[PDB]
Design a protein around this nucleic acid. Structure first.
Ligand code: MG
Length: 1051
RNA sequence: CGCUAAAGAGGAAGAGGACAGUUUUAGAGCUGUGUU
RNA sequence: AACACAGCGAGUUAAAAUAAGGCUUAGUCCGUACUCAACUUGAAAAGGUGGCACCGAUUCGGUGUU
DNA sequence: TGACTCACCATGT
DNA sequence: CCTCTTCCTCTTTAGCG
DNA sequence: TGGTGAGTCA
């Protein structure tokens, strides 16, 4: 029997359905391997495959660039330290050493607690004389007195460590008029104002009430000044709290005004220091180096280098400064030396690296995939475009009947006279020329509406900048012009643009040269120079451009030149293109590269895998059709490649399987007309129901009207034939062929939409990113947690391994990659007594590699004197308990084996009578449908049976009891409560995408819901040791049709 | 279905740089009393 | 000597880290992207393994056969 | 001393 | 939050296999 | 939405 696959490719789901005949999904008994007693499990061929959504690489890119910037910053400080090392060693041996051990607790510090000066008194004096670093920077910048070298290094390292934004280009040099340092003076002003205003607010809040004083200033937890300085509060929250407190108090207008202008007790380091140019820091740096150079000689020699450390930005075109082994770097080194900031010009070739940066990402031409595309603004590309549009210009003749294309000489004269004269060509100018050259008047133009899309913009621009028409006119100079446009396109920095442009300096003038240096064009074309001009045809010895400009017989567009049988352009392109044989091998490689975000790419790859395994399931008989709907078009191409690869002859490729792309509206139209409603909340069976329905629709549409088929198949709607609003049986019109029967086939459609069994599968993944509230997370939390409590049990990853997590605080939230079952012998009961213990051990993403290197050693470090088997369970591994409860194992906690997050794999099935009610309930607030209101008003008695069914399903397969009791207590108000609240409680708010009562019975993680005004907490207390007793691990396949039940008890 | 160009709209990949946030330490704790 | 109860004062900043880390790959580089049912040939590229029909549906069950 | 409960929280412009 | 670069995709126009 | 700290009971 024949069969046709259907598919629902999607971001988080792929739904697969197989139809043999008469719109029916066949049932096949699939063997079950493993230590089980169920030899054959009979599975319906409806199915779904659920996967975690693919993640874009933006977060990885942002964290990679951040990582690199921290590394480069520490390298800049190390550079300044190597500059200061020889002279500082006499002043203080361990100043750098004391700075490096600032994090450490006093005992673990190598020399002293006080970082800067190493003794209590001098540190006290430093903080007294300069309360903040900005006072120090101002003093060094403006005081012509010898400074302790430590202080100078601290100021310079403050500027290098925190330098300003580089957006402003040029040289940049406030209320203060005499100071060298503007920023230092402004922040010293903020220091003084904040101190004085703190004193005044202290007096006021204390005087009204001492309790307010204590709460605001001496209680860190609150949002007051104690929260502002020694807490997690921010300016906005502190202002809100202060205004709320101060509003009641009488006469507190000064503080309220300053808060209103957002300048009341401001902090020197604020989110508002972002808009500070680096030139301000450089102005301070120059002053400090200059004034202290006279006293310290080494500063005079290294003054240029110290500035270079601050102002050096790795150019964007010169990427990561690798020697290789880096996937992202493109830099092309010219020497072998290490890349210090001073020698970056020497070591690296900026021209070659900048050219590689653009040419690595440019696209090879499709027609002849061996050459790079021409620059978008090249004269050749425009001249190719201008003629191509101009050739097909057809003018209606006032007297002559014939509608005729432009003559070649007319094309030459038109382009010369007008296209070169004016940037924007129109219809009117061409009608004028045609009237001038030919006496006919009243001519209109075809192929051209109003302005020409094509223009020689580059010709006019280069004419003005060059200031010479003759240079553009001459064909000999055309190669020079092409090289000029190439250097403008590839190179973006004006310096290197003029550097390469200096080659063609003899022809032009320097003033013209610089003006050309300003002009940079962007973008690249989709054709190549060799194609347009290099390729030739033997019979005429003419390029494609030569034919477009002058093809005597008629004006033919570029594709017509390429495809014409007489011309050898088609032979040339085919020769080159099958020289370019890049099938890419495995389907993984081609699927990775199709257009889109990785999220859809995952769906596509899994859809190919489902189709392959479905072919294996059905006996190896290739599908009669496949119907991808994306309810992706790239799949159609990919599925065409694998299935329709075979060609009877090299001349053409035969097609056997019709990859089909139904439009989305068809499924919705069928669903609404015949009331096969979908509720996304109830169960995940809707993906499979959608796939089966579209398989049915596509089969019928191809069955009844073959005429539309060519459009529908790859390479007044049709839904009316599904509508009988007509004889009982529908048969093809104009021929005798099978068409869908109006009632009997509908019976099969509804029954297959009321099948309890759908082979739902959640792909077992070994996680690499932890998940918090749906946002990816790494190995652990990105923010260091506070120091543990004095007598609190914490599993904190240290900041660095040499730093103890207890004393120095640590990282919390270790994410678990997977969990391994370990049968073996464990010391238990403190007597080391042997036992046959089958218990999970969770493995973190942190130590995944360590586990993989030696599984036995990792498991043995955790006990397990003898290990006899290690079943390795990825996330979402499925256990079916004895009762019939399926508990997918999300993870086993790394810290504790006996705690883990277990989802619920059981999917509730609701009869059609309930599903209609639920769909109506979710759509109640919708203004469009009165029928929803009337149905929910007429069938309120369904709600009682629905609640009881959800609660019994909760009782048997789910394990929630307290939530069930709260739900039962809440439901007693069913007879009298708001119908809007009844519906929202059962299904959810309209459009919320959050389920109501069905969040108790949905698959996956449990989430909080509100039922009739009662907040029901999420049930997350499934225990990981309940899986082990009397349950069977199910190793389902990608389709889910093929499973291996490894019973844990016999194991 | 595949192309080229124009005006619109929306993404993807990559490079460079800034500001904050978090953690520990250094820079403010002192006095009277309860207390073992 | 330490823990606390009350009173009175300071509070703005600096250093270090900012995914743990890995390497003969030692770079001013890489470390959250894509890939991953089970058993079994596979160093690896890539492959192999699971009969059909019929009646029904609270998750698949029961039949007829080979 | 391990199942059965509840509460807090997490990097962004 | 700022600067830069390329590659894609969707509807519509002009030509087109 | 997943870690997991902390509390009370058989
Ligand atoms: Mg690092």
């Amino acid at each position: 029997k024949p069969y046709s696959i259907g598919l629902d490719i999607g971001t988080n789901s792929v739904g697969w359905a197989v139809i043999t005949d008469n719109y029916k999904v066949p049932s096949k008994k699939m063997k079950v391997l493993g230590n089980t007693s169920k030899k054959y499990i009979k599975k319906n061929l409806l199915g779904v495959l659920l996967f975690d959504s693919g993640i874009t690489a933006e977060g990885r890119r942002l964290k990679r660039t951040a990582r690199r910037r921290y590394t480069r910053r520490r390298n800049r400080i190390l550079y300044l330290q190597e500059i200061f090392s020889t002279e500082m060693a006499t002043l203080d041996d361990a100043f750098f050493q004391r700075l490096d051990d600032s994090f450490l607790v006093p005992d673990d510090k190598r020399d002293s607690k006080y970082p800067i000066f190493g003794n209590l008194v001098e540190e006290k004096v430093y903080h007294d004389e300069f309360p903040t670093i900005y006072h120090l920077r101002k003093y060094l910048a403006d005081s012509t007195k010898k400074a302790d070298l430590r202080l100078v290094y601290l100021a310079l390292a403050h500027m290098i460590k925190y330098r300003g934004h580089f957006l402003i280009e040029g040289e940049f040099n406030v209320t203060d008029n005499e100071t060298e340092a503007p920023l230092s003076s402004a922040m010293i002003k903020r220091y003084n104002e904040h101190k004085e205003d703190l004193a005044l607010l202290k007096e006021y809040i204390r005087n009204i009430s001492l309790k307010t004083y204590n709460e605001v200033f001496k209680d860190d937890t609150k949002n007051g000044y104690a929260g502002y300085i020694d807490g997690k509060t921010n300016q906005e929250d502190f202002y809100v709290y202060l205004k709320n407190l101060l509003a009641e108090f009488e006469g507190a207008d000064y503080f309220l005004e300053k808060i209103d202008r957002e300048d009341f007790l401001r902090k020197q380091r604020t989110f508002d220091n972002g808009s500070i140019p680096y030139q301000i820091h450089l102005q301070e740096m120059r002053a400090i180096l200059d004034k202290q150079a006279k006293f310290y000689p080494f500063l005079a020699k290294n003054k240029e280098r110290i500035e270079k450390i601050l102002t050096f930005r790795i150019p964007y075109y010169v990427g990561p400064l690798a020697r290789g082994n880096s996937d992202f770097a493109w830099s092309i080194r010219k020497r072998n030396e290490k890349i210090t900031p001073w020698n970056f010009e020497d070591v690296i070739d900026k021209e070659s690296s900048a050219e590689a940066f653009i040419n690595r990402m440019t696209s090879f031409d499709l027609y002849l995939p061996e050459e790079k595309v021409l620059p978008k603004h090249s004269l050749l590309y425009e001249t190719f475009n201008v003629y191509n549009e101009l050739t097909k210009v057809r003018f209606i003749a006032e007297s002559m009947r014939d509608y005729q294309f432009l003559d070649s000489k007319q094309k030459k004269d038109i382009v010369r006279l007008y296209f070169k004269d004016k940037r924007k060509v129109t219809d009117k100018d061409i009608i004028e020329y045609l009237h001038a050259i030919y006496g006919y008047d009243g001519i209109e133009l075809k192929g051209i509406e109003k302005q020409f899309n094509s223009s020689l913009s580059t010709y006019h621009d280069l004419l003005n900048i060059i200031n010479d028409k003759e240079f553009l006119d001459d064909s000999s100079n055309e190669a020079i012009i092409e090289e000029i446009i190439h250097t403008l396109t590839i190179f973006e920095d004006r310096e290197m643009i003029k550097q390469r442009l200096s080659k063609f300096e003899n022809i032009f003038d320097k003033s013209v040269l610089k003006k050309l240096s300003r002009r940079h064009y962007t973008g690249w074309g989709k054709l190549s120079a060799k194609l347009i001009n290099g390729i030739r045809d033997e019979k005429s010895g003419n390029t494609i451009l030569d034919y477009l400009i002058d093809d005597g017989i008629s004006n033919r567009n570029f594709m017509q030149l390429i495809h014409d049988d007489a011309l050898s352009f088609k032979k040339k392109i085919q020769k080159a293109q099958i020289i370019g044989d890049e099938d890419k091998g495995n389907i993984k490689e081609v699927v990775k590269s199709l257009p889109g975000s990785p999220a859809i790419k995952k769906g596509i790859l899994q859809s190919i895998k489902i189709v392959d395994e479905l072919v294996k399931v059905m006996g190896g008989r290739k599908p009669e059709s496949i119907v991808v709907e994306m309810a992706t078009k790239h799949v159609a191409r990919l599925l065409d490649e694998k299935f329709n690869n075979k060609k009877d002859e090299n001349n053409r490729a035969v097609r056997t399987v019709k990859i089909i792309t139904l439009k989305s509206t068809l499924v919705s139209q069928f669903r609404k007309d015949f009331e096969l409603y979908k509720v996304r909340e109830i169960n995940d069976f809707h993906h499979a129901h959608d796939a089966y329905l579209n398989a049915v629709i596509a089969s019928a549409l191809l069955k009844k009207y073959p005429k539309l088929e060519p459009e529908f198949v790859y390479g007044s709607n049709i839904m009316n034939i599904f509508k009988k609003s007509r004889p009982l049986i529908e048969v093809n019109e104009e021929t005798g062929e099978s068409v869908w029967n109006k009632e009997s086939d509908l019976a099969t459609v509804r029954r297959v939409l009321s099948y309890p069994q759908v082979n739902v599968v959640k792909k077992v993944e070994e996680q690499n990113h932890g998940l918090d509230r749906g946002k990816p997370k790494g190995l652990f939390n990105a923010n260091l947690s506070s120091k543990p409590k004095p007598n609190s049990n914490e599993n904190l990853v240290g900041a660095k391994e040499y730093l103890d997590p207890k004393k120095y605080g640590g990282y919390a939230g270790i994410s678990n990659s997977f969990a391994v079952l370990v049968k073996g012998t464990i010391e238990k009961g403190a007597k080391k007594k042997i036992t046959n213990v089958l218990e999970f051990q969770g493995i973190s993403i942190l130590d995944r590699i360590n586990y993989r290197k030696d599984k036995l050693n990792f498991l043995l470090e955790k006990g397990y004197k003898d290990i006899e088997l290690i079943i390795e369970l990825p996330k979402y591994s499925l256990f079916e308990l004895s009762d019939g409860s399926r508990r997918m194992l999300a993870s086993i906690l790394s810290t504790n084996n006996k705690r883990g997050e277990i989802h619920k794999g059981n999917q509730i099935f609701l009869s059609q009578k309930f599903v209609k009610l639920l769909y109506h309930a979710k759509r109640i607030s919708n203004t469009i449908n009165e029928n929803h209101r009337k149905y929910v008003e007429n069938h309120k008695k369904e709600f009682e049976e629905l609640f009881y069914y959800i609660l019994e399903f909760n009782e048997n397969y789910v394990g929630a009891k307290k939530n069930g009791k709260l739900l039962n207590s809440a439901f007693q108000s069913w007879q009298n409560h708001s119908i809007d609240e009844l519906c929202s409680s059962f299904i959810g708010p309209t459009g919320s995408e959050r389920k109501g009562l069905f969040e108790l019975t949905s698959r996956g993680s449990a989430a909080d819901f509100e039922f009739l005004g009662v907040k029901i907490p999420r049930y997350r207390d499934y225990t990981p040791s309940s899986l082990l007793k009397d349950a069977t691990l199910i190793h389902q396949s990608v389709t889910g049709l093929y499973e291996t039940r490894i019973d844990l008890a016999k194991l």
